[PDB]
Amino acid sequence: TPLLQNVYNRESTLLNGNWKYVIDPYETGYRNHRNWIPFDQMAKPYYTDKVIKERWDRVEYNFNTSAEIKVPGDWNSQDRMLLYYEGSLWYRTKFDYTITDNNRLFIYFGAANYQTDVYVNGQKVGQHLGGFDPFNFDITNVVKPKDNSLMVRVDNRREKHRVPNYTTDWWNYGGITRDVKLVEVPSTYIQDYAIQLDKDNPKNIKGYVQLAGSSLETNVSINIPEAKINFSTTTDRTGRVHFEIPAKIKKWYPKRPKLYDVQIQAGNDKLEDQIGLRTIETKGADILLNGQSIFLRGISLHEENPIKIGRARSIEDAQMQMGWAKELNCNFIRLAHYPHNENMPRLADKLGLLLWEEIPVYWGIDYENPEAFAQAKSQLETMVHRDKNRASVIVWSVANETPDTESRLEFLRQLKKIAIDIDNTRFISAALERNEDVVKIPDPFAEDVDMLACNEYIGWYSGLPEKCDKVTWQLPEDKPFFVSEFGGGALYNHHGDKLTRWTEEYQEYLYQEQIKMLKKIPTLRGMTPWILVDFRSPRRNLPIIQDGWNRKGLISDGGFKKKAFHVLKAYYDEMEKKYNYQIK
Amino acid sequence: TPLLQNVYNRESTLLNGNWKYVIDPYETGYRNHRNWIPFDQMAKPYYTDKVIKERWDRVEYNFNTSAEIKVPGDWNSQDRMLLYYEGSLWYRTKFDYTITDNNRLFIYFGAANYQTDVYVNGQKVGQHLGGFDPFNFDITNVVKPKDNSLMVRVDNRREKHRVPNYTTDWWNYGGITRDVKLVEVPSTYIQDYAIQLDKDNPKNIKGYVQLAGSSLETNVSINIPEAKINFSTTTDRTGRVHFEIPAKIKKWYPKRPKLYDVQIQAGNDKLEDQIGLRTIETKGADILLNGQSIFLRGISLHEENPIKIGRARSIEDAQMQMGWAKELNCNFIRLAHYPHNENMPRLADKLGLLLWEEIPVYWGIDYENPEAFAQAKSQLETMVHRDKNRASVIVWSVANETPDTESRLEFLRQLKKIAIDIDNTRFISAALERNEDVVKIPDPFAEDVDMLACNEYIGWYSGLPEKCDKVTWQLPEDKPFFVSEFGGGALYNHHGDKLTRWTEEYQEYLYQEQIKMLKKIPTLRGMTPWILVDFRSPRRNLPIIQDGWNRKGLISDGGFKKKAFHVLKAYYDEMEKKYNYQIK
Numbered sequence A, B: 001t002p003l004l005q006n007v008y009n010r011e012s013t014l015l016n017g018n019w020k021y022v023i024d025p026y027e028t029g030y031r032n033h034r035n036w037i038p039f040d041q042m043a044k045p046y047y048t049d050k051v052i053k054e055r056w057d058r059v060e061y062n063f064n065t066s067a068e069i070k071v072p073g074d075w076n077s078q079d080r081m082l083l084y085y086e087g088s089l090w091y092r093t094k095f096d097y098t099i100t101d102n103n104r105l106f107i108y109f110g111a112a113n114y115q116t117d118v119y120v121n122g123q124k125v126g127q128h129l130g131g132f133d134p135f136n137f138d139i140t141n142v143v144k145p146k147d148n149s150l151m152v153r154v155d156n157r158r159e160k161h162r163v164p165n166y167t168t169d170w171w172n173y174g175g176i177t178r179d180v181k182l183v184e185v186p187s188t189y190i191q192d193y194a195i196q197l198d199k200d201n202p203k204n205i206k207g208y209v210q211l212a213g214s215s216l217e218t219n220v221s222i223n224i225p226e227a228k229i230n231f232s233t234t235t236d237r238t239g240r241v242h243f244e245i246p247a248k249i250k251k252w253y254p255k256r257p258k259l260y261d262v263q264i265q266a267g268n269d270k271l272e273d274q275i276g277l278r279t280i281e282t283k284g285a286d287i288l289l290n291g292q293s294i295f296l297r298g299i300s301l302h303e304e305n306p307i308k309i310g311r312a313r314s315i316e317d318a319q320m321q322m323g324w325a326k327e328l329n330c331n332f333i334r335l336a337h338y339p340h341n342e343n344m345p346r347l348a349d350k351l352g353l354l355l356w357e358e359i360p361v362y363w364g365i366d367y368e369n370p371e372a373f374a375q376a377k378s379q380l381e382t383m384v385h386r387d388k389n390r391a392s393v394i395v396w397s398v399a400n401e402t403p404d405t406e407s408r409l410e411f412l413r414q415l416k417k418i419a420i421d422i423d424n425t426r427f428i429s430a431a432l433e434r435n436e437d438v439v440k441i442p443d444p445f446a447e448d449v450d451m452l453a454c455n456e457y458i459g460w461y462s463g464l465p466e467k468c469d470k471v472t473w474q475l476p477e478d479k480p481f482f483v484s485e486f487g488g489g490a491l492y493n494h495h496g497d498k499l500t501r502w503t504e505e506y507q508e509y510l511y512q513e514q515i516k517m518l519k520k521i522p523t524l525r526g527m528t529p530w531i532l533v534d535f536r537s538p539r540r541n542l543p544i545i546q547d548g549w550n551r552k553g554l555i556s557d558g559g560f561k562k563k564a565f566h567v568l569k570a571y572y573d574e575m576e577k578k579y580n581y582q583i584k
C-alpha cells in the first residue's frame, strides 16, 4: 500500500501503551514446525488469537495471560532477557473502533525492525521489510465496532538477503520502535503530494497530488494563504494531477527557517502541512542555498537515546539531540545509517538544521541478489517519499562503505535513478572511502554524486595523529568536497598524555590535526565527524573502555562533553564567521 | 582426529573453572566484517589473545579484563542475558603443562553446542560440528611449559544444514556443556578397542585393538583377572589386531549388572575399563537378553537438570535421574534426542538399566544436502564409538519423527549402514509415526529396524483418552513393537476433573486408557513414555501452564511426582512379575 503523505498532521488514534507479547525463537506460532512453511501460505497459528471453548480443548498460547511490553520502543532495553534477542516476537493488543459512514481505516507504523507481519481478527493485512521506514495497511473491511484482535509479529533475525544483513557497527534493536496509530480518511483521500520549488525554475512551485480510494475523479485544491498562492482543478481516472505554479515567497534558511502553512484538499479530505521553500545546488566547488555560498558545519548521529540505552523515537529525543548539535554550533546533521523517526526532519524544518538522510546499504550487502535489491529499493522509495516536502533535507545518501565491484556499481546507479525519478530537488551522495603519501578517490560512483563525500580515520585506524599533517589530498576542483566521517574513540574522564589511546587528550589531539589537514583542501565545504554521542555496538568489546559502546562520541553515554567537543566547536565558530551572509 | 576410547578411565588434567568470555553476535572476532570470510582461512582475530605493547596501540578486546563464566555448563542458565542467546561466544583460559619425554597431549571435550573452533597460542588446533558428541585434538607441537592461551569459540546459531536445524522441542543450550580436560598418552597409545560377547557364539569374547602414534608393531595384552583371561598378541604395521578369546563369565542383566575389570596394555600405555558381557537379539516378536525373553519397562529423558533449569553433565545428575527411573520401576531409559554425557551409559552399566541412544536427525533436516548428511554421520560415528563397550546400551536411534520422503529414506539407510560397520551387536531403530479406526506403520523404514518403535499421542494430540480403547493396531507379528513416546501435559498440583486438560487427573486418565490400548498388542515388548521430568522448550508458550516448559513430565520441574507416575509404576510392577526370569 503506498505511504500516506503527512500522516504527521492527520488526526490519529494512538495504539501506544502496554501490549501482550510472546518470545518465539523457533517461530512455533508463525511456521509449521515440520516443513518450515508459514501458516499464512496454507487454532495453531498464534495470529488466530483463540482461547479454549471447552475445558478439554488444547491451545498452547494465551495472549490474555501473557507478559506485557511497552509500545513503542526497542525490546532490547526493556529487559536483560531481550538485550541480545535477535529473532521473532509476537505483540498483541485489543481496540474498539466504529468507522463513520464509508470512511477507510488505516494502521500506520512509524517503523519496526526488521520484518513485520500484521493481523487483525486473525486475518493477514500486511507484511513490511525494512527496520526504519514507515508503512500502513487499509484494515477497513476487517475491523468491527468492539473487541478487535491486533497481532503484529516483528522478526529482526540477521539474514543474507536483508538490508542490513550479517554485520553493522550498531546494535540490532528489534520490535515496534515508533508510534502505532489508526488513521480514518474519506472513501477518497489525499494519498501523496510534492509541493517544492522547481530546481530548473525557482520562480515556480512544482509538484503533484495523488488521490486513492473509491472514485479518484474529484476536485483538488492547494492553498498557501500567506503567499496569496492558489491552485484548484479536476483529477482524471488516475487520481493524479501535475502543476507548475509561480511563487514573493520568503525562502528557508538555517538562520531564518520560514515554514508556510499549506492546505491540501480533495473531495471531503482536508490536510494541513508546514513547508519551507529553498533551492540547493552545486556551482563548481561551491554549495549554494538560495544562491548563497554555505559551509556544512555538521555532526553524525545514530537514532539512539544513550541515557535509556535504547532507540530514540519522540519529539523530546529530537529536541535533546538537536540542542546538543546547536551547542556544537552545527547548521547540519548526518542522520545515522537509516531513516530516523519523522520528528527529526519535522523539528529540523522548524529549528533551521539542514539534514543528510541514508538507507542501511552498509558493507557486504548481497548486491547480486534480486531480493536484497528489492528491500534496499522499498526503503529508499519510502524514505524519499516521506520527507520530499522537507526544506531541512538537502542530501539523500544511498550507501555507506561499499565494495568496488561491478555488481555494486550498478546497484548504486539503479538506486540513484529510483531517488531521482521520485525527487530531483536534492543532492544524491554515498559515503565513500579513499586510496593510498597522497590520497585519491578513484571510485567510479564519484562521477555520479552531486557532493563528493568521503569517510577517513587517518588519526585513528590509519597511522597516529601526526600523519594528518604529512598527507596531501588530490581532488576534482569542480565539485564540493565533504567528509561524511572522521573521528576517534575516547572513554569520558579517562585522561592522560595525548599519545595514550582512548584518553580524551588523544581524541582532542586527533581532532586538532584532522581539522588542520582538511583546512588545506580548497574544495572542502562540510563535515559530519563520527560522532556526536557514544552509541551501542556489539563490535566494540574492549572491557572498561568500550563495554559495547562505540566511544567516538564528542559526548559520553551519560551526556557529558569530552575535550574534543570544544576543538570542533571553535573551528565551527570560525567557519560561521567566514561564511556569514545577508538574507535578501 | 579419531576419538580416544575410554578417556573416562585415563588420567586427565581438568580445565574446568571460571573462564574469560566475550559475547560476539556479529562474529567480529572470527570473520572479516566486509566479506564475511573467517580470519582462519586468510590483531583483529580474538584468538590471537593480544594485548597492547605501547599506550598508542589499538586492540578492541582484552580477555584479561573480560567478564567470567563457569565451564562446564550451558551459558543460558548462568545469566538472564544469555537465556535466549543464539550465536557465537568466546571462552578463554590459560594453563601450564610440561609434557613428559616424547608423550602426546590431547585436549578432550565431552561436548560443546554446536560449532567449536579451538586455538592454542593463537594457533588453530581443530573444529567440531555437533552439539552433544565428544572430540579431541592433538596439541603436542603447539603447547609450551607456561602461560598457554586456550581459546574456545562456540557458536549455537540455528542454520539450515545443521543437525538439528531450524526447530526442535527443546531449549538451544549453547556453550561448553561438559568437562574439558588434557589427556597425556605415550608416543604409541591405545586409540580404540571393542570387547563384547560374540553374538553368534556367546562362549567367546570378540573384538579388536587399534593403536596410534610412532611405532605401531608392539605387544598388546587384555587381562580380565576375575574371568581367568590372560590374552596376549602382537600388532602389524597398521596397529589394528582382531581377537577371539574363550570365556566362566557371569553375564550382565538389569537385575544383576556384572561388570568385569579389564586391563588393555600396549607398549608403555595401560588402560583400565569396566565392561559387562551380554547378548541382545530378536526372535520374531521376542527381545532376548542372554537368550531370556524380556520387556522394556522404560521412560524417556532429556539431558536437563530441572532444579538448575540448565544442562545435566555430572555423575550426580545421572544418580538423580536414574534414582527417579528406579522409583518408577524402570529397567530401560530412552535418552533424549542426542548423546547424553558419558556418565549416563557408565552408571547405567553400574545400576542395571538398559538404554536407547539417539542422534538429533529430527523433523525437517536438510536431507538433500550433503553437508547435513556429513554432520549426522560424524555425530553417529562419535556416539557409537564412545559407547560400543557399554552393556547398558542396546539401541542406536538414527531418527525421531522424520518426513516420509525418498531423500530421508536414503539418509536413514546410509546412517544404519555407517552404524552397522562400527558395531553390528546392538538393535538399530528410529522413532516413527503411525497412519490413520485402524492404526498401521506404512513407513518404508519400518522394514529396516530390528525393533519397531512408534511415537503416538492418541489421548492428547489426536482425540481424547476415550479414543485409546476404540482403536485397533495392525503391526507385523514378526518383529518386537515399542512405544518410543506417548504422554500428555499437566501442571503439577493443577487438579480437577479428568476431562480438564492440563490437570493431573487428565494425565492419570490418559495413562490408564493408553496402557489399556497397548496391553492388547501381542507384539508389544516395551515403552518409554514422554517423559520422566518436565523440561525446557521455547515451543511451549502457554502462560501459567507451560511458561517455557514441556509439561509432559511424570515429575514436576521442582521434582514432585504427579498422579500419572503411580499408574505407570503399578503397570511396571505387573510386567516385572509377568516377565520374571531365574538367571543361570
Ligand SMILES: O=C(O)[C@H]1O[C@@H](O)[C@H](O)[C@@H](O)[C@H]1O
Pocket (backbone or CB within 6 Å): A168, A169, A170, A337, A400, A401, A455, A485, A530, A550, A552
Ligand atoms: O569506525 C567507526 O567508528 C564507524 O564507521 C562507520 O562506517 C559506521 O557507520 C559506524 O557505525 C562506525 O563503524
Ligand SMILES: O=C(O)[C@H]1O[C@@H](O)[C@H](O)[C@@H](O)[C@H]1O
Pocket (backbone or CB within 6 Å): B168, B169, B170, B337, B400, B401, B455, B485, B530, B550, B552
Ligand atoms: O510433543 C511432545 O511432547 C514431544 O514430541 C517429541 O517427538 C519431541 O522430541 C519432544 O522433545 C516433545 O516435543
Ligand SMILES: [Cl-]
Pocket (backbone or CB within 6 Å): A488, A489, A490, A540, A546, A549, A550, A551, A552
Ligand atoms: Cl570505539
Ligand SMILES: [Cl-]
Pocket (backbone or CB within 6 Å): B488, B489, B490, B540, B546, B549, B550, B551, B552
Ligand atoms: Cl506440554
